Amino acid sequence: DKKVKELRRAVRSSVWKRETIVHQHEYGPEENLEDDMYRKTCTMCGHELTYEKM
Amino acid sequence: GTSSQAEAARILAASWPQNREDEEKQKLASHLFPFEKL
Amino acid sequence: KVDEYGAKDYRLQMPLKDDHTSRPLWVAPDGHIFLEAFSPVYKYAQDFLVAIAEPVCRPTHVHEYKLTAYSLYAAVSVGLQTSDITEYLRKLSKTGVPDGIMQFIKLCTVSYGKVKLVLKHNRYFVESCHPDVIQHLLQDPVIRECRLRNSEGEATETVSFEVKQEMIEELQKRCIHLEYPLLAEYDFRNDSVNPDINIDLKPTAVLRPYQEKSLRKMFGNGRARSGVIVLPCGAGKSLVGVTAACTVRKRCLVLGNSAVSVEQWKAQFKMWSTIDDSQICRFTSDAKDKPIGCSVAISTYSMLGHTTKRSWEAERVMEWLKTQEWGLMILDEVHTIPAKMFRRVLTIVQAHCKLGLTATLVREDDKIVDLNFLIGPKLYEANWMELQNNGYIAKVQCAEVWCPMSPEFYREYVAIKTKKRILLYTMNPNKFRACQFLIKFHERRNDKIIVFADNVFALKEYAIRLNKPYIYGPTSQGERMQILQNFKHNPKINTIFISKVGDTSFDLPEANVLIQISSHGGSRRQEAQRLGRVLRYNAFFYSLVSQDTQEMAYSTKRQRFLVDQGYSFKVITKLAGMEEEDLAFSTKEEQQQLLQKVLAATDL
Amino acid sequence: VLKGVLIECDPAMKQFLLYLDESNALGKKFIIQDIDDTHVFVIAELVNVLQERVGELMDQNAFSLT
Amino acid sequence: TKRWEGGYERTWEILKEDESGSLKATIEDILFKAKRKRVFEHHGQVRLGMMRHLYVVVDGSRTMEDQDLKPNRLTCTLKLLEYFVEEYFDQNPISQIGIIVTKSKRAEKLTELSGNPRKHITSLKKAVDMTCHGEPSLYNSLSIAMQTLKHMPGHTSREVLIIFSSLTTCDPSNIYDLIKTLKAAKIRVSVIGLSAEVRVCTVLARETGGTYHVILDESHYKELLTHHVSPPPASSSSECSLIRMGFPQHTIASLSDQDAKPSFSMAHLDGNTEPGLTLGGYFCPQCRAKYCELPVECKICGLTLVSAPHLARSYHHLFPLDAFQEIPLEEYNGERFCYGCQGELKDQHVYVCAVCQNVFCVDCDVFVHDSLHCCPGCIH
DNA sequence: AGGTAGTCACAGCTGATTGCGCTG
DNA sequence: AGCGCAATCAGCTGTGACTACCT
Ligand SMILES: [Zn+2]
Ligand SMILES: [Zn+2]
Ligand SMILES: [Zn+2]
């Protein structure tokens, strides 16, 4: 059991490649509010980015 | 890579205790270790 | 008492001022002694305070001591009386002794010699000069279990009665609570019952004056009493034990922690005691050098307190060893006495004097106080600063150099918390570069380096990357011996890696540089032991930690013993010439690849 | 255009703030724009909670001798 | 019995009180007792000496390439030899040093026996980059040293120092006969080994009166060389031992006067580059030859040019100052001002010179006995 | 909302198995 | 292919801190 345990994890540990999750905010179409305000909503995590466009 | 060396050196050599100590130096042996005296 | 600034103010309690600054001493109402080192009477004050109090910190300018009950018991054990200690305390006070210290001293030192414990004919008897105290402790229910067969009274001469041998620890624990502490005094000068041996130390083993003070305090008035002597590893500790064994001139028993310390003690006895090998025996189930019928017996812990079946030869040796009295049972590495199986070792054998020797008396779980009644009071505590001032202890330049966490490692460090972050700050690439630079710099100047590193998983990839010898720890007995043997008398190789193996007293050769990475949590004992492997700026030892990690708090809380000893840990933030030469993990590619292997443990 | 407070710090603290953004330790995604490896853009209305969190991280691994 | 098995010492019993506050008097006594920790002598050993003609023999075999002393035995040996030459010339004014290098069963006379330290140091620096090959020959080195030192005057002490790294030496003839000849010639031979004890070196040192030692480490090597620096004791009076030597005054030339005469230095004339044609320097009192360094024996007339302060620096040993009579302040019925520093005498003890009966305080007494070596009152 | 017994890492010891070497 | 020394595994324990569950 020990000699099979010491080798069964060698291939298991070599399968996963990426651990950190990519967190790029993919905003959709902008929404226009009052006072020339523009808001972008992220489609992946719901992040709201409100900005004033010149 | 050429740029990778420079980027890694910039990150490592001056991460926390250099962005302020160097600023103070710009604005301004017995107890020194042997590698700090050479 | 008042907290106007949050400080206990006792200005009104001790207003006496006859001489402005003649007396270099301060006292406190509850209990404390402050000493001025920059005084012409410094040595006399030190001699007075050592004999009556134990130190708490000895910096370069103002030494600080504390008054405890056991310190006063040790003081009155010596010929010092109440009047002498009180008059010499008031002699050097500069402020007047508060009327909360005089009463405490009187209460502690009055009840010292009332109760005695003696060993005779393999029987334990407790004898008191005052008969009334026996009836006073007669009502205690816990004491009644020790007395077997109704304890008819043992009418002799002086009132005494027998106590159970296996329950001697319980009565010692209860007596201090009953304000009647027990004393273990062995008058080896006149026994005529013990077959005193012909041991005699050679007249060529000179000892330093500080060892003279400890030995003299051991034998205050011609008798030997149990106690603890604290001396650094580089200093002479085994020599003190050998000299004490020679002076006691009785059957000595030496206990060690490892199976290699028995050979160390045998070598010390052969070097400084002039004893034939026939009388010297080692009892560690390796050679079986006929321990039956021996003058000095050397064995180890974890063998006298087995809870399982024992070997037939070992069983017979234990049967022989538990049937006679012992004079000066020397215990080595006394800090790990208060253990579940090591405490019973003292009660499983019978000895008159119990001597404890150690270098790092600090321990967690606050079980060191139990050692006050397990063995005895703290007899001697060496002043490490004045010891290194005399030049007989290496003046080690302590360093606490931290290395910033790389961005690729800090994200994983802050992401995980379930004990998986130990390998993250341990395998910091910046710390790796710092260690490599230190190794190379101290090799360029021919300095012996010992690199301590717990978490042997990290040590595996730490040592093979530098291609240097390392001690995994369960490797063998021979490989470790040959590596340590060729570490000293070889110029080609002068740096080794140790994983928690050198955290005890071994025969490691003289070294100048110590670089510890990823030690235990808050073990002040481990740091003190690792420092002791260097002293023997002659030397310097470095501790590498990772910033913004728990290792910072661990390093902060594990140096408070050494700063109490007087050491100062300079903080090193930048290493000169870090970019001057090439180091490992130069680029980000291998640094980010290191995350894959350091996260590949997945021990779930 | 975006209005807020630019934060300049060591890369380690930048990674810590980036982790705090995704971990929702503050209740929202106010760490909006990352511009440099050592600079980030943070909304100014809750700069105090970031200060509290950074101070907690700093004195957590400090072991004050008091 | 044992010293520590008796009664425990109470060192704090010294201090006592009679008026409740005399601890100030006790600490004043302690502070006074702290001073005078010396015997009023900087050396306290040999107060004299004799002209030594010392020959230093350096092994040049392959064993010098060993890395027992970092980086190798040769480099550490030559560095410590430079230090030894400097210290020896500092502590011996009219001594001479010769250097012999033995290699490939032959001995090469690296430097002539003379008193110039700079020449010896330059020769050692040049020999740093030598080639270590072959085996040493103690016989040839001792033969060269004996041939050079046989014609030296008897009053000078003839000494040979051998640095033997290799454990094997090749002798073209019997060496014990050479040892007997050296013993008959009263030549002292001292050997400092590097690896281990060799019988021939022990026999040579014992028979010739020298000392044989083996190096433990670089510090022990330096200690042995420093011990060899010290001059040997000198007999009372042997014969008319004297020597004709000059004292060249350092007369430089100034163009403000009409007698500004540039001259080439004889020592610099042998250099490959242009010799220093300085305005002036050390002119020989006998033949007006010009030299820059001292002490250098004159090349032309053979006169020994020495510096008078160097000889005078050891004159205090011949006439040490007798210790002043310690007198308590109350018993001295005279002036209460120190004769050296004019300070008021408030110490419990006052020191009075035996000759002039003047008044000196503790600090001035220590300064006079340790550094000044003369009583200011006796000078007047 | 707070505190103590499992638990993991790393080391030690002793008590047996058990596996390779064993003559000019 | 019988002995015997030596390498090896099991069981217990010390040190230190981390962590899940509930009155
Ligand atoms: Zn001349
Ligand atoms: Zn004076
Ligand atoms: Zn005079």
Report how far residue B36's alpha carbon sits from residue C580's, in angstroms, rounded to the nearest whole number.
13
DSSP letter (8 states) at residue C149: G
Q: Identity (one letter) of the amino acid at C63?
A: H
**Strand G-contacting residues in C 471-500, CB cut-off 7 angstroms:** 476-478
Let me know if C428 is exposed, middle or buried by CB neighbors in 10 A (0-12, 13-18, 19+). Answer: buried
Question: Which nucleotide has the shortest C1'-to-CA distance from C453?
Answer: F10
Report how far residue C420's alpha carbon sits from residue C349's, in angstroms, rounded to the nearest whole number.
45
Q: Cβ distance C570 to C398 under 8 Å?
A: yes
E228 phi and psi angles, rounded to 5 deg: -65, -20
Report how far residue E305's alpha carbon sits from residue C474's, in angstroms, rounded to the nearest whole number.
73
**Structure token pair of residue C318:** 């234990």
Please, what is the Cα angle at C447 between C443 and C449, to 5 degrees?
85
Q: What Rg value do the Cα atoms of chain C yield, rounded? A: 27
Q: In what order do the strands lie in the sheet with E187-193?
A: E106-114, E96-103, E52-59, E157-164, E187-193, E212-214
**Structure token pair of residue E323:** 């210790």
Report how far residue E151's alpha carbon sits from residue E147's, in angstroms, rounded to the nearest whole number.
8
3-state secondary structure E279-317: CCEEECCCCCCEECCCCEECCCCCCEECCHHHHHCCHHH
Nearest ligand (C-alpha, residue E340): 2
**Strand F-contacting residues in C 481-500, CB cut-off 7 angstroms:** 499-500
- The number of helices, as runs of H, and strands, as runs of E, in chain A is 1, 3
Q: Write down the experimental method used for this entry.
A: cryo-EM
The total of other beta-carbon atoms located within 10 Å of residue C13's CB is 15
**Structure token pair of residue C441:** 């710099």
Element holding E211 (H helix, E strand): none
Angstrom CA distances, E293 to C20, C95, C493, E267, E301, stand at: 62, 68, 47, 8, 17
Alpha helix segments (H runs only) across E117-217: 117-127, 138-149, 175-184, 199-208
Residues 398-417 of C with CB under 8 A from B: 399, 404, 406-407
Q: Kindly identify which residue of chain D lies nearest to residue C414, measuring between CA atoms.
A: D16
**Structure token pair of residue C352:** 């008159």
Count Cα atoms within 13 angstroms, Cβ side, for C325.
19
Q: Cβ distance C584 to C432 under 8 Å?
A: yes
How far in angstroms lies nucleotide F23's C1' from the CA of residue C477?
29
CB < 8 Å to A42, chain D = 29
- With CB atoms and an 8 Å threshold, state whether B15 touches D11: yes
Contact, C365 CB vs strand F, < 7 Å? no
What is C98-129 written as a DSSP string? -TTTHHHHHHHHHSSSSEEEEEETTEEEEEES
C77 phi and psi angles, rounded to 5 deg: -60, -40
Report how far residue E227's alpha carbon sits from residue E221's, in angstroms, rounded to the nearest whole number.
10
Report how far residue C547's alpha carbon sits from residue C541's, in angstroms, rounded to the nearest whole number.
19
Q: What Rg value do the Cα atoms of chain A yield, rounded? A: 23
Angstrom CA distances, E163 to B22, E8, E102, E132, E190, stand at: 53, 52, 10, 14, 9
3-class SS at C452? strand
Nearest to E187 by CA among E166, E217, E207, E212: E207
Which residues precede chain breaks (C–N over 2.5 Å) in chain B? 28
Report how far residue E185's alpha carbon sits from residue E182's, in angstroms, rounded to the nearest whole number.
5
DSSP letter (8 states) at residue C247: H
In DSSP terms, E160 is beta-bridged to E55, E189
DSSP letter (8 states) at residue B35: G
How far in angstroms lies nucleotide G22's C1' from the CA of residue C281?
56
In strand G, which positions have an atom below 7 A from any protein CB? 7-8, 11-20
User: For this experimental structure, what is the resolution in angstroms?
Assistant: 3.3
Residue to test with chain D: of B4, B7, B11, most D Cβ within 10 A:
B11
Q: Cβ distance B3 to C569 under 8 Å?
A: no
First to last CA, chain C: 54
Report how far residue C285's alpha carbon sits from residue C283's, in angstroms, rounded to the nearest whole number.
6
Nearest ligand (C-alpha, residue E283): 1
Nearest to E110 by CA among E96, E97, E93: E97
- With CB atoms and an 8 Å threshold, state whether E12 touches C40: no
- State the smallest CA–CA distance between residue E18 and chain C in angstroms: 12
CB < 8 Å to C407, chain B = 11
3-class SS at D3? coil
How far in angstroms lies nucleotide G18's C1' from the CA of residue C519?
16
Q: Is the peptide bond before E295 cis (omega within 30 degrees of 0)?
A: yes
Domain ranges of chain D: 1-66
Q: Cβ distance E152 to E159 under 8 Å?
A: no
Work out whether strand E52-59 and strand D39-42 pair parallel, antiparallel, or are unpaired: unpaired
**Strand G-contacting residues in C 531-570, CB cut-off 7 angstroms:** 550
Report how far residue C182's alpha carbon sits from residue C195's, in angstroms, rounded to the nearest whole number.
26
CB < 8 Å to A54, chain D = 1
Question: Which nucleotide has the shortest C1'-to-CA distance from C314?
Answer: F14
- Site of tokens 């080994």: E193
Burial D34-47 (b: 16+ CB within 10 A, else e): eeeebebbbbeeee
Report how far residue C169's alpha carbon sits from residue C172's, in angstroms, rounded to the nearest whole number.
5
The total of other beta-carbon atoms located within 10 Å of residue E303's CB is 19
Please, what is the Cα angle at C429 between C423 and C435, to 5 degrees?
100
Q: In what order do the strands lie in the sheet with D5-8?
A: D5-8, D39-42, D31-34
- With CB atoms and an 8 Å threshold, state whether C599 touches A19: yes
Residue to test with chain D: of A36, A45, A54, most D Cβ within 10 A:
A45
Let me know if E47 is exposed, middle or buried by CB neighbors in 10 A (0-12, 13-18, 19+). Answer: middle
Q: What is the biggest distance separating any 2 CA atoms in chain A, rounded to whole angstroms?
A: 71
Report how far residue C440's alpha carbon sits from residue B35's, in angstroms, rounded to the nearest whole number.
11
